[PDB]
């Protein structure tokens, strides 16, 4: 078969930037295709050989290249251009794609809005307690979330989940769920969530005392 070695693996750029993605073929081909896969959706046709733009595709997308080295050029990057881009070869059997190039939007630093959610009384009945901490609409992606339970730092009992960059405001959202047994949870008073972020001059902490509505 034919390997589409795509470059780079990922990249970030500000709105208005000129973004170039390289793809490289193991054998000489005449043209490549390009596809745009938005998160949680199928690949969408972006450019088809030689360089015709697919339906809905704006004029800011162009495909160039000759021997084995081809390029996708986004002339002016927009917030909704965040996606994985795939080059495709079509001359040979089987058809092969590149591994993908993830494109992030780079915007001004945005601080997270931190919310804490105690375990619902409905859940405690099941015999398990899940404390959820929420970090909302922030940039960049990098953020540290630490669990304090009665001033003790928690390890190996919480999970994080990150939202894919928003298409409008180019921001992320983070959740962290501390998970205890009703028994263990019933043994402590203060549940804290210490958020550390770049756009946050001092770490923010949201807390509650077990059953304090």
């Amino acid at each position: 078969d034919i390997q589409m070695t795509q470059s780079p693996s990922s990249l970030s750029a500000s709105v208005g930037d000129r973004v170039t993605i390289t793809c490289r073929a193991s054998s000489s081909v005449s043209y490549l295709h390009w596809y745009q896969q938005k998160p949680g959706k199928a690949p969408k046709p972006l450019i088809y050989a030689p360089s015709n733009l697919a339906s809905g595709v704006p004029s800011r997308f162009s495909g160039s290249g000759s021997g084995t080295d081809f390029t996708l050029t986004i002339s002016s990057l927009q917030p909704e251009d965040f996606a994985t881009y795939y080059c495709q070869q079509w001359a040979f059997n089987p058809p092969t794609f590149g591994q993908g190039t993830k494109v992030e939007i780079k915007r001004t630093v945005a601080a997270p809005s931190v919310f804490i959610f105690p375990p619902s009384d409905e859940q405690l009945k099941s015999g398990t307690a899940s404390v959820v901490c929420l970090l909302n609409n922030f940039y960049p992606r990098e953020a540290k979330v630490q669990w304090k339970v009665d001033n003790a730092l928690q390890s190996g009992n919480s999970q994080e989940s990150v939202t894919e960059q928003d298409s409008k405001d180019s921001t992320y959202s983070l959740s962290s769920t501390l998970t205890l047994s009703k028994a263990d949870y019933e043994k402590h008073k203060v549940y804290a969530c210490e958020v550390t972020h770049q756009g946050l001059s001092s770490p923010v902490t949201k807390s509650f005392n077990r059953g304090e509505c």
């Binding site: 199928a42 050989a49 795939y86 495709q88 089987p94 859940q123 909302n136």
Partner: protein
């Protein structure tokens, strides 16, 4: 409008079998070649095979010749993928895509379907537990739903049956230590719209036929 709808994804034990369906509407079914392309989560796109509905002529990827088989039911406009002797690495989102030749030799994947997730696992199907994330005293407050303990994926969460969309984040599922998936869906709303405006999350886990509607209330 050309529409490709896929079905038959879900849980399968290693060594097991499955058959995926692609239902094509809005165009002359026999006039276009249909393909199957799979995508393991976090990775790239892998071509499985293709069939010409017009005469049933197939073409497969060398790596799937044997275990994988494509077929057509012309009268139902349906394309099929038969996956045999499945292995753990076969977990992926399977796409059917239409192909158009616009010139001699020149062809491209012009229309893609929504894709079904086939998940190869020795685990059993488990329905999701749904707990509320009560809001509770800036000019806005946060509230949500905890879609805990379920297998496999996916789960779909809508707010007020699609009436609430703006400011809704539905986090990626996370495989817990328990070996069961869990996720959360959150929404930020005006603080004044609490106590008067009612909010409900709608969780659907098709792999277990679970439909739960959860009214989220402050206390």
């Amino acid at each position: 409008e050309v529409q490709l709808v896929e079905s038959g994804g879900g849980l399968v034990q290693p060594g097991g079998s499955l058959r995926l369906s692609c239902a094509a509407s809005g165009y002359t079914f026999t006039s276009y070649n249909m393909h199957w392309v799979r995508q393991a989560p976090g990775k790239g796109l892998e071509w499985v095979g293709a069939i010409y509905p017009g005469n049933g002529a197939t073409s497969y990827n060398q790596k799937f010749k044997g275990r994988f088989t494509i077929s057509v039911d012309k009268s139902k406009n349906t394309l099929y993928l038969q996956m045999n002797s499945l292995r753990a690495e076969d977990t992926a989102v399977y796409y059917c895509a239409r192909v158009v030749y616009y010139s001699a030799s020149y062809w491209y994947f012009d229309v893609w379907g929504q894709g079904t997730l086939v998940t190869v696992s020795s685990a059993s199907t488990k329905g999701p537990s749904v707990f509320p994330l009560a809001p509770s005293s800036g000019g806005t407050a946060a509230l949500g739903c905890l879609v805990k303990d379920y297998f496999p994926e996916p789960v779909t969460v809508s707010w007020n049956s699609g009436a609430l969309t703006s400011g809704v984040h539905t986090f990626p599922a996370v495989l817990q230590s328990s070996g069961l998936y869990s996720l959360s869906s959150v929404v930020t709303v005006p603080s004044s719209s609490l106590g008067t405006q009612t909010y409900i999350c709608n969780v659907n886990h098709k792999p277990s036929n679970t439909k739960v509607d959860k009214k989220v209330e402050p206390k």
